[PDB]
Amino acid sequence: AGASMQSAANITLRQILEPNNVNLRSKKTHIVCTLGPACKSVETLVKLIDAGMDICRFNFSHGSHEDHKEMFNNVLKAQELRPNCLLGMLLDTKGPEIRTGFLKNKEVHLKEGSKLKLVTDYEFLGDETCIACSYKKLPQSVKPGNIILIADGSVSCKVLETHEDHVITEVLNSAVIGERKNMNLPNVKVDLPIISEKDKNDILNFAIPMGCNFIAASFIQSADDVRLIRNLLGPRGRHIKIIPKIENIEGIIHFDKILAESDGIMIARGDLGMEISPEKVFLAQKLMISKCNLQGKPIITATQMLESMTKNPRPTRAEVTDVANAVLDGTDCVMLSGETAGGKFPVEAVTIMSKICLEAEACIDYKLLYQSLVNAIETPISVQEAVARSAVETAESIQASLIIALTETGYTARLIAKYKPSCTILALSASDSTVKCLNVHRGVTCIKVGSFQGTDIVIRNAIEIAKQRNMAKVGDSVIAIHGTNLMKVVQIELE
Amino acid sequence: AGASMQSAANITLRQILEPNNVNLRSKKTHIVCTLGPACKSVETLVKLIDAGMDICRFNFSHGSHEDHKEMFNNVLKAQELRPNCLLGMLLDTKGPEIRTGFLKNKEVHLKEGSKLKLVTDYEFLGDETCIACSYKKLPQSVKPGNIILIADGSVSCKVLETHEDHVITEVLNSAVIGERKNMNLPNVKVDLPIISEKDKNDILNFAIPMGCNFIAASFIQSADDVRLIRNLLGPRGRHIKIIPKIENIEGIIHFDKILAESDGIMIARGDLGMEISPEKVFLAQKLMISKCNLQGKPIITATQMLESMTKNPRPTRAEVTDVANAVLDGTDCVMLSGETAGGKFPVEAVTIMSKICLEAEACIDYKLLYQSLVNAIETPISVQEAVARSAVETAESIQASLIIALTETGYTARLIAKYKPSCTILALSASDSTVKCLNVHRGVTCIKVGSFQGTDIVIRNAIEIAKQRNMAKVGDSVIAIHGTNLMKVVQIELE
Amino acid sequence: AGASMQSAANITLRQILEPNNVNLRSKKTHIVCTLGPACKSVETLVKLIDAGMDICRFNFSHGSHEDHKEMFNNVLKAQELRPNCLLGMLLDTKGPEIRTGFLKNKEVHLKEGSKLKLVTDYEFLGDETCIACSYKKLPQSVKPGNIILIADGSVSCKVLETHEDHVITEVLNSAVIGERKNMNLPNVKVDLPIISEKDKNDILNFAIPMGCNFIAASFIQSADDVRLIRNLLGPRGRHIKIIPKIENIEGIIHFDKILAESDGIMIARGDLGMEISPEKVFLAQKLMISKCNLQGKPIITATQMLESMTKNPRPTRAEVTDVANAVLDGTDCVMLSGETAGGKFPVEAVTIMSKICLEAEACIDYKLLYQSLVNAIETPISVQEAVARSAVETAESIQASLIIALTETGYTARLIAKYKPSCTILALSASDSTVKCLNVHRGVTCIKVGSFQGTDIVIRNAIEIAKQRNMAKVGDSVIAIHGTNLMKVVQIELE
Amino acid sequence: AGASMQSAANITLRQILEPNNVNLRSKKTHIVCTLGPACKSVETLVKLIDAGMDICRFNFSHGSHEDHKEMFNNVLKAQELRPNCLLGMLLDTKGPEIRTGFLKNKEVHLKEGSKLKLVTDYEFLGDETCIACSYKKLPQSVKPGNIILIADGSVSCKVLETHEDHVITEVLNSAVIGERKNMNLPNVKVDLPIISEKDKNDILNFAIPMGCNFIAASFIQSADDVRLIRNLLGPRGRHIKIIPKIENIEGIIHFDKILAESDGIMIARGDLGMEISPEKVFLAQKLMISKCNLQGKPIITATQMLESMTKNPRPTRAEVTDVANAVLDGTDCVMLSGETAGGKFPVEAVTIMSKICLEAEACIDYKLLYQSLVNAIETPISVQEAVARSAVETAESIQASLIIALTETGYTARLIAKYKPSCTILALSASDSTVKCLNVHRGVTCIKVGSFQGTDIVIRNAIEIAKQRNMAKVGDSVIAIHGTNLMKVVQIELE
Ligand SMILES: [K+]
Ligand SMILES: [K+]
Ligand SMILES: [K+]
Ligand SMILES: [K+]
Ligand SMILES: [Mg+2]
Ligand SMILES: [Mg+2]
Ligand SMILES: [Mg+2]
Ligand SMILES: [Mg+2]
């Protein structure tokens, strides 16, 4: 039903033993970094750009519009210091989240086998006996025996009980639990809007005026939720890409229809693991990546990729393989959440993420990858897709150092990225929206151009920029595509 | 040079959404659990057996012979309560380890940019300014600029300095550091024996008399180290399997020759990541697994697989994919270290490890896996290997529920396991060594038998045991191999 | 719709330049020889056996029961002189043939553009102006413009005309035309029974009492024609195999249903080329072979394979490739018609046919052939088919010199033959019908045995026969199958 | 050593039953026709053009320069009546032929077992007892026991004897033998120059002044023979292509080096079958085609393809499969010899040859063919070859109706032809040599153009010609290549 396969690797002793020698920003896999107090300064944001940050994620689960607007201003200043590293701006919606209230002493130590009751009144200041929940209809949604998870599942509670005003639970494990933590109610219908009023106002009064490029919509359940977001964006938001977050059972069941309506997908592994059991999450990840790859839809793999680096300067062995395998699975982007937003090693986390990406990208057999993609796609295809596919096959056959794509809307660049070239895709566009939105596709780096007139010289200009960025050198071949109906091969010579 | 590939997966909505319904011990991937105070009781050891523990690892980096012998006695009592779950016993050598001394207050808080000097005298009781190192020749081995890592790299120190008696370093990050922690000296020749006197006495005076089945030899660097271990074992230890641990550059460079001499391999990812940089470790893992798979040599993937479950009741998303990917890569065994030896959730860690294994095993396309193995092996092969390969292909072609292997030495079962059947391999043997040593191969479960006389009825007895264990039912086919030159297919009927 | 593929060949300079060194009867492709006056003597029939003849074809389009019974008697005497070369006996029905009458001077020279009329009265003795036709309803079946072909299309006539009693045609080419030649009426419904009274009496009063093994039924058009033949054979003829001849449009359209009812197929290329145009015949041949191969149904490729050797001692270059390509396409049998029945070089034709077969069989890559067959067959398959397939894969993996099959009905041998082993299939059977009927399957040679009791020694006896026939030698492996649920591999040793 | 494979076919009931509906000259396989008295008239030569003739073969084994010059003049008149069907002109050298002398009564009936002596004196007028041989050193080259074949092996003679002046042989079969027939001396070193004085004067005094495009050099044995022909052609003959004929053991042994020096190959099956035994010839054909295909060198399959049509209006079943299989093997050209030079049905033979080609070309799976070619060629390849390969893959992916190639020298067109597109390759060139020489490559049809200036409009002109030739229609896509570094895709629209 869902054939899923990692790219074959050719792993050499040289690659294992010889250190990496390329700029981190030469990587093909792109990185979404969540902003927060740990990277609030312009100086730290510039360091994250240099380490490999490509898209900035504003998590509207927390903070006010003024908090995010101040962050956005420091990002714009960081952008001015790296004007050719064009960052995409992503708004991540709160969605139908459920959270615990506040605590009498800010933290509580629940003990295993102890009782814990939760109350519908959100202004209660709780303690170890008692805590508030932001979901007013909690008593009517849970039936006895259901499990309640708090703080990314750091503690779980079995619903022994329910009444009109509250629920009684037994703590299934001991844990220290902080303020305002998330709660999951697996296998329970939660009566909250998928797109809330707050969500609609974050999209309309922040993402549109501020110029965000992506809406990452939480807990999406149907193709209709996506169509509603597109309709709210309206003509003024027509260039903002919709990225549904798949993090519950409904989003899995309806994934094919959600994907068809979407501009791309985020694999929201934290909530997904709490809604389906954790052992299943890798199945969902590899299947969504495979389906997105076949459709040419970009996908972001998210959550706990390098989690221990919130506290440690190096990741665990499982964290290393998680980043590499997400690359080898076919992800376009990988993501950091607390590792950049609130941890002690944000630059180090982005740095090692880029280094793992580079190792995983370098070991791939791109001949077999290309053949396996073409083997899995029905023909005839459109002229545009066939020319883009030939740019990739040609580049691999001669070991070209780049593919230059002239693209108004980005469509040509997306089609080339679908065929996963070993080399960088240098997309040229006159549209500001296009050069930032393309960041969600693997291997695409964009340059804003004034125009496409004199395609010969625009290509020769782009070749000049590529040599200046050390992406190509005398003796290299480059592929150029425009039209999407023309492909040219140019050898770089001494002039 | 090293083609490496994961098995293709067929991932269905049903598998993602429907809970697992099989006994945890029906899994094919086997689990090595490190014993320690967290699983010291007979009752907890019995729970680890039920959760999926197959091999018990005694880590001789710590503790005395009396400590390990007491543990061994509680394991034997746990074995008596699960007499048909025959556990393998593995001794893991200390090897040429380097460790910090003790501390004036048992713990120290090093601060970034602060100075730290280490001294050759191991009886010094250190503090934040000063710590002892067990390697007397530390000053003569490091030159200025080398990096010293302590406590699994939780802190790193740059060697600013060296003298006859000590080294001066600058702390590169702040960390709390405990007692007796390991130290790595990457890219430095350490002058310590690969097989120390202590190692030789642990092998000769504990593993041989106590009946251990495997020696996992630390920091192996050459085929000669393996030959020396085989020679020390001698005729009395001829049935003890040698498992080199690959955890340094020399072991990577000489891996092919080490493997040829070995009975199997342990991927020792903790030290390997500190000796080669962490971003490279996944390359080394996938290449060793691929080479071991092609040779029919069993491999154990080790270290930080479910690390956060030392403290948390559920693993991170990266930990889940790490176990599943190690299965999909082709590992025979996965391993737990502190998660079982000293953590707060040892039964839960083994339980979720088994559940991830079952999900990864279930999504594999075993048709493609079998074809890719036969495509990669030169023919003609031996009669024994060709019959074993046909048992697997036949079982897959008719969806047999098991392959029964009559085997004196285990050789037949190892050859069947090399071809990675979807079904369990039930190995019957009269040898006590064989039924425990086979635990390191994927999918092999053993039964001690009195004899092979009347092969018809020994097979019919094994069929009876398999129905009693719910491994097969009326209507199933089973494959039986013996000789290694005969294969029979038997349908289970009502009688 | 119909994927068709030749086996891949590995062609070496050694094979092109070094002469063949094996007995002609060691070939896997079997030969059907049509008997006639050119091989009427016992001595010539013995020479055809030695040259590679496996099945004797009695063409009931010509001759009386007494003529064929005398031939049959000389074949039985030839069989007594080669008692271990068990020949199959095939009756080829006349079917709804149409033939010209006799001639005033036995031959006529039609001239292009000259008129020629044909008359419904079969006793007319014709000449160049006028000839009789055995189909009484010729005038009512042809409409003006249809083409009439005579003597294997050596002349064609356009139907200019039709009346109640006759047809007028213009000769489209000049030709000398003999007595009693066949006529084709392409794209015209001929009103003759598919199974005529004469056919039913040849089957019932000759093939059943004489012990023929195959009925090759001419011009079969539907699965119902096959069912009628099976019903006429009845219980007394239950062991006689039905081989429909595909030689008209209806047989092509209904081929899948004809095949399902059939015991095998004959590609009757002479008539097929006249009913569909000649340029299409190779399409029909390769598609029927592919479908028969996938179903495990044996197929005979017939007609004009070595035609010029009716007159010349060596074949043309196109005749050589035709035999080799029919082998590489996957045919079980190839056939000779006038080359053995009436030509001047019958022993030479069978000899060179065998030599071409041996060259084509020797260049095949049997690894790829086996994989392509298993890739094209749905699983699960029956236990019997899976064991037979494993006998082939095992034999290829160790370069076994033969597969021994104990088979009552032949079913096991047919299943092994479906997977096209490089080595001979030695089928042992106690049934006289089985040991002769299996001759239509590629690579199967049979031995009549008294019994299967003591399977160990029956196999050891068959091994002894194989060494005596130089099919195996000390150092070889052989595969043995019986049950169909057991496979054994035996190495031949000095004893 | 020599992997050889036919293209996979997808054979449908529709193709078997529906008649061909395309112009014969739309075929991709090209036809070499040997000229002779049967096609001497301008009218018959025009009919052969319309039937599919692409290259005219002048066989200098027979006739004088005046005979061939008169033929050449009638070909030029036929060319003037079909000025857009640009024919290639091929001179086929006599080479070191051996022939019988003349006969007292022009024909002789040798009888099997009768004696026959041959004499070194070529003016002897022989009979059934005695015949002359053109090889003066026959007595010193044959030793007793060697076989002498005469008239394409229609009779063979065993050398019982040898003296200084003559040889005595026993006729091994009865045959009627005409005048001036060829003789083969298999496995005997013949002392004749590979390139004789007559050959050098036919090349220099006929092929160069008359404007022939190919020299088909008989009995080539080494790369040095090819280099000598290139040197004789010199600067004036630099545009004449050298096609060695492979027809003896030395040419097989040295085929790889001969091929490297050659512009293409002719498989000379008549002599090859007499020098190696006939059963081997199909091995040699399929291996040479495979090697030529991999190198991009065009190959002609020659001799006895439709032989019976020298006398019959329709071919045998083996002749049909021989043409189709030579196409499916990968031949660029197929050839007719006596079928056009001296037979009774020259237009019919060329017509049915074209029709078989069209059926074989239409059933090919061009997706698998393309992948199997790219799978078998080492990369990196040249920029030119990679762009040509992408023109083919793109055309197949969108079902383009043609590939337009702007080419000065033909190199671009040859590289496209190497990848065997399903569609026609329309090559445009300003060179007269190029537009005629390209005829030896499959699928290439050329147009002479004035210039390549304004590539946009030259392409739009070629598109206009293609619609006028019914090679493309509104709605089709076409591929255009020039540079070899640019590929464009153009959709044909209403204008
Ligand atoms: K959020
Ligand atoms: K250890
Ligand atoms: K017949
Ligand atoms: K010639
Ligand atoms: Mg979430
Ligand atoms: Mg270690
Ligand atoms: Mg017929
Ligand atoms: Mg010749």
Q: Do the beta carbons of residue C186 and residue C194 sit within 8 Å?
A: no
Q: Peptide bond preceding A380: is omega within 30 degrees of 0, i.e. cis? A: yes
Give the separation between CA C229 and CA C244, rounded to whole angstroms.
10
CATH number of C366-492: 3.40.1380.20
Give the separation between CA C176 and CA C112, rounded to whole angstroms.
11
Helix (H, G, I), strand (E, B) or coil at D317: helix
The one-letter amino acid code at C285 reads Q
Catalytic annotation, residues of C: 57, 99, 245, 303
**Encoded tokens for D147:** 């076989």
Q: β-strands D108-110, D175-177: how paired? A: antiparallel
Long-range contacts of A161-167 (CB under 8 A, 24+ apart): A161/A117, A163/A139, A164/A139, A165/A119, A165/A120, A165/A139, A166/A117, A166/A118, A166/A119, A166/A120, A166/A139, A167/A117, A167/A118, A167/A138, A167/A139, A167/A142
CA C14 to chain centre: 31
Give residues with Cβ within 8 angstroms of A359, minimum separation 6.
Answer: A15, A20, A324, B279, B280, B282, B283
Other beta carbons less than 10 A from residue C418's beta carbon: 24
Q: Do the beta carbons of residue A98 and residue A183 sit within 8 Å?
A: yes
Provide the angle, in degrees to the nearest 10, between the axes of the packed helices C411-418 and C383-398.
50
Place of tokens 């903070």: A63
Helix (H, G, I), strand (E, B) or coil at A43: helix
Give residues with Cβ within 8 angstroms of B43, minimum separation 6.
Answer: none
The one-character DSSP state at D8 is P
Q: Cα-flanking dihedrals φ and ψ of residue B33, to 5°? A: -115, 135
Of A293, A484, A491, A488, residue with least CA distance to A394: A488
**Encoded tokens for A56:** 């900035």
Ligand 4: centre distance to CA D62 (Å): 8
Other beta carbons less than 10 A from residue A119's beta carbon: 18
The reply to whether residue A278 touches residue B253, judged by beta carbons under 8 angstroms, is no
Q: Do the beta carbons of residue B403 and residue C403 sit within 8 Å?
A: no
Ligand 6: centre distance to CA A24 (Å): 30
Give residues with Cβ within 8 angstroms of D156, minimum separation 6.
Answer: C313, D147, D148, D149, D150, D172, D173
Query: For residue C275, what is the nearest residue in chain D, using CA coordinates?
Result: D17
Q: Do the beta carbons of residue C250 and residue C222 sit within 8 Å?
A: yes
Which residues of chain B lie closer than 8 angstroms to C394, CB-CB?
Answer: 386-387, 389-390
Find the distance separating the first CA and the last CA of chain C, reported in whole Å: 55
Q: For residue C125, list its beta bridge partners.
A: none
Q: Peptide bond preceding C421: is omega within 30 degrees of 0, i.e. cis? A: no
Place of tokens 């039930």: B426
**Encoded tokens for A320:** 């290393």
Distances C467 to C373, C430, D473 between C-alpha atoms, Å: 30, 21, 68
Place of tokens 């709804």: C96
Residues in chain A: 495
Give the separation between CA C42 and CA A326, rounded to whole angstroms.
76
**Encoded tokens for B332:** 């025979």
Helix (H, G, I), strand (E, B) or coil at B48: helix
Give the separation between CA D323 and CA C321, rounded to whole angstroms.
10
Give residues with Cβ within 8 angstroms of B371, minimum separation 6.
Answer: C371
Q: Do the beta carbons of residue B98 and residue B182 sit within 8 Å?
A: yes
Q: Do the beta carbons of residue B465 and residue B480 sit within 8 Å?
A: no
Nearest to A279 among B2, B318, B356 (CB): B356
Place of tokens 């999209």: A203
Distances A185 to A182, A195, A284, A467 between C-alpha atoms, Å: 10, 18, 19, 54
Other beta carbons less than 10 A from residue B261's beta carbon: 17
Q: Which of C147, C316, C356 to mutate to test the interface with D (most CBs of D within 10 A)?
A: C316
Q: Which residues have a C–N gap over 2.5 Å right after them in chain C?
A: 483
Give residues with Cβ within 8 angstroms of B470, minimum separation 6.
Answer: B23
**Encoded tokens for A159:** 């619903």
**Encoded tokens for D37:** 């008295």
Q: Do the beta carbons of residue B8 and residue B370 sit within 8 Å?
A: no
Query: For residue D374, what is the nearest residue in chain A, using CA coordinates?
Result: A397
Provide the angle, in degrees to the nearest 10, between the axes of the packed helices D281-295 and D317-329.
30
Give the separation between CA A147 and CA D237, rounded to whole angstroms.
90
The one-character DSSP state at A347 is H
Phi-psi region of C219 (alpha: psi -120 to 50; beta: other; left: phi over 0): left
Q: For residue B267, list its beta bridge partners.
A: B246, B301
Give the separation between CA A78 and CA A39, rounded to whole angstroms.
11
The one-character DSSP state at A106 is S
Give the separation between CA B42 and CA B52, rounded to whole angstroms.
16
Other beta carbons less than 10 A from residue D419's beta carbon: 26
Distances A82 to A23, A46, A89, A153, A437 between C-alpha atoms, Å: 15, 7, 15, 39, 17
Q: Do the beta carbons of residue C292 and residue C265 sit within 8 Å?
A: yes
Q: Which residues have a C–N gap over 2.5 Å right after them in chain A?
A: 483
Q: Which residues of A215-246 are buried (b: 16+ CB within 10 A; e: fewer)?
A: bbbbbbbbbebbeebbeebeeebebbbbbbbb
Q: Peptide bond preceding B380: is omega within 30 degrees of 0, i.e. cis? A: yes
Other beta carbons less than 10 A from residue A451's beta carbon: 9
Ligand 5: centre distance to CA C88 (Å): 75
The chains found to touch A (3+ Cβ pairs under 8 angstroms) are B, D
Q: How far B347 CA sits from the closest chain A CA (Å)?
A: 14
The 3-state secondary structure of chain C, one letter per residue: CCEECCCCEECCHHHHHCCCCCCHHHCCCEEEEECCHHHCCHHHHHHHHHHCEEEEEEECCCCCHHHHHHHHHHHHHHHHHCCCCCCEEEEECCCCCCEECCECCCCEEECCCCEEEEECCCCCCECCCEEEECCCCHHHHCCCCCEEEECCCCEEEEECCCCCCEEEEEECCCEEECCCCEEECCCCCCCCCCCCHHHHHHHHHHHHHHCCCEEEECCCCCHHHHHHHHHHHCCCCCCCEEEEEECCHHHHHCHHHHHHHCCCEEEEHHHHHHHCCHHHHHHHHHHHHHHHHHHCCCEEEECCCCHHHHCCCCCCHHHHHHHHHHHHHCCCEEEECHHHHCCCCHHHHHHHHHHHHHHHHHHECHHHHHHHHHHCCCCCCCHHHHHHHHHHHHHHHHCCCEEEEECCCCHHHHHHHHCCCCCEEEEEECCHHHHHHHHHCCCEEEEECCCCCCHHHHHHHHHHHHHHCCCCCCCCEEEEEECCCEEEEEECCCC
Q: Do the beta carbons of residue A355 and residue A51 sit within 8 Å?
A: no
Q: How far D87 CA sits from the closest chain C CA (Å)?
A: 25
Provide the angle, in degrees to the nearest 10, between the axes of the packed helices A281-295 and A317-329.
30
**Encoded tokens for D129:** 């007892």
CA A93 to chain centre: 13
Alpha helices in A82-170, H assignment, sequence order: 138-141
Which residues of chain B lie closer than 8 angstroms to C383, CB-CB?
Answer: 398, 477, 489, 491
The one-character DSSP state at B6 is P
Q: Do the beta carbons of residue D6 and residue D418 sit within 8 Å?
A: no
Share in percent of chain B as helix, strand, coil (round to 5): 40, 20, 40
Give the separation between CA C315 and CA B284, rounded to whole angstroms.
61
Give the separation between CA B412 and CA B428, rounded to whole angstroms.
10
Q: Peptide bond preceding D96: is omega within 30 degrees of 0, i.e. cis? A: no
Strand (E) or helix (H) holding B479: strand B477-482
Alpha helices in B335-493, H assignment, sequence order: 338-341, 346-363, 366-375, 383-398, 411-418, 432-437, 455-468
Residue D486 burial (C-beta neighbours within 10 Å; 0-12, 13-18, 19+): middle
Give the separation between CA D59 and CA B462, rounded to whole angstroms.
79
The structure's method of determination equals X-ray
Q: Do the beta carbons of residue D54 and residue D357 sit within 8 Å?
A: no
Q: Do the beta carbons of residue C381 and residue C84 sit within 8 Å?
A: no
DSSP D59-121: ETTSS-HHHHHHHHHHHHHHHHHSTTS--EEEEE---S--BB--BTTS-EEE-TT-EEEEES-
Q: For residue A9, list its beta bridge partners.
A: A364, B4
Q: How far A285 CA sits from the closest chain B CA (Å)?
A: 9
The reply to whether residue C386 touches residue B399, judged by beta carbons under 8 angstroms, is no
Give the separation between CA D35 and CA D45, rounded to whole angstroms.
9
Give the separation between CA D467 and CA C15, rounded to whole angstroms.
50
Give residues with Cβ within 8 angstroms of A457, minimum separation 6.
Answer: none
Other beta carbons less than 10 A from residue C450's beta carbon: 8
Give the separation between CA D261 and CA D242, rounded to whole angstroms.
9
Alpha helices in B60-218, H assignment, sequence order: 65-81, 138-141, 197-202, 208-210
Of B56, B106, B108, B107, residue with least CA distance to B79: B56
The one-character DSSP state at A144 is T
Ligand 4: centre distance to CA C210 (Å): 56
Give the separation between CA A16 and CA A363, rounded to whole angstroms.
10
Distances A231 to A204, A238, B104 between C-alpha atoms, Å: 11, 9, 67
Q: Cα-flanking dihedrals φ and ψ of residue C118, to 5°? A: -120, 140
Binding site listing of B for Mg(2+) = 247, 271
**Encoded tokens for C237:** 């003829």
Of B363, B339, B360, residue with least CA distance to B351: B339
Size of interface A-B (CB pairs under 8 A): 218
**Encoded tokens for A257:** 């229809």
Q: What is the dihedral of CA B250, B251, B252, B254, to 10 degrees?
A: 80
The one-character DSSP state at A63 is S
Helix (H, G, I), strand (E, B) or coil at D271: helix
The one-letter amino acid code at A314 reads R
CA atoms within 13 A on the CB side of C203: 28
The reply to whether residue A390 touches residue D386, judged by beta carbons under 8 angstroms, is no
Which residues of chain D lie closer than 8 angstroms to A379, CB-CB?
Answer: 367, 396-399
